[PDB]
């Protein structure tokens, strides 16, 4: 069921959207009555699937990664933390990133165009013996 302009956003791009008269889930607070007509409030939710009456009785459970969601008065939209930022992790791989700094760590874009290219780089760049042909 459609009510209150229910959108779903994420960093790289918005997750989803719609108008959901009911959003059936349990807030990080607790059981959250699926409703239109809730007040301006702030919220967050763990990963998982929440059935929602969304536009025209279309109620669906949609898994989450963990992420934040809130409603300005009447204003509905959703944000998913792509994941919960890894505790330690980011700080553990900090050490890595640090070790990565410390013990060097490198990655690259190896495109068959970049690859086959560089093939043409030595290769094509090599085998110029006319390099001496010009003069002044």
């Amino acid at each position: 069921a459609m009510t209150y302009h229910l959108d779903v956003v994420s960093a790289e791009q918005q997750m989803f959207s719609g108008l959901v008269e009911k959003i059936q889930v349990t807030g990080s607070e607790g059981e959250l009555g699926i409703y239109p007509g809730h007040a301006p409030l702030l919220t967050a939710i763990k990963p998982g699937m929440i059935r929602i009456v969304k536009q025209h009785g279309h109620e669906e459970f949609i898994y989450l990664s963990g992420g934040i969601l809130e409603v300005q008065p009447g204003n509905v939209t959703v944000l998913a933390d792509t994941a919960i930022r890894g505790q330690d992790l980011d700080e553990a791989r900090a050490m890595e990133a640090k070790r990565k700094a410390e013990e060097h760590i490198s990655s690259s874009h190896g495109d068959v165009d970049y690859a086959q290219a560089s093939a043409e780089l030595a290769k094509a760049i090599a085998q110029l013996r006319v390099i001496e042909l010009t003069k002044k």
Partner: protein
């Protein structure tokens, strides 16, 4: 001089047992060093192994010399 562009048929047959023995790797760096050379053809193409092929190839290349006047022992 131009090696391997220099080609003589008599060869290290006359290189005595050790000279016979130890004489091998020449064309190698003629390959290898020069082979190592090929890596430059792509700017920043090298590998630590190949880096060793300029260690032997290029560094062992740094080895050899003969003077404007060179005797040989």
């Amino acid at each position: 001089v131009n090696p391997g562009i220099s080609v003589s048929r008599v060869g290290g047959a006359a290189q005595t047992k050790i000279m016979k023995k130890l004489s091998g790797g020449i064309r190698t760096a003629l390959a290898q060093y020069r082979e190592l050379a090929a890596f430059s053809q792509f700017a920043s193409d090298l590998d630590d192994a190949t880096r060793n092929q300029l260690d032997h190839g290029q560094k062992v290349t740094e080895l050899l010399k003969q003077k404007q006047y060179a005797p040989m022992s």
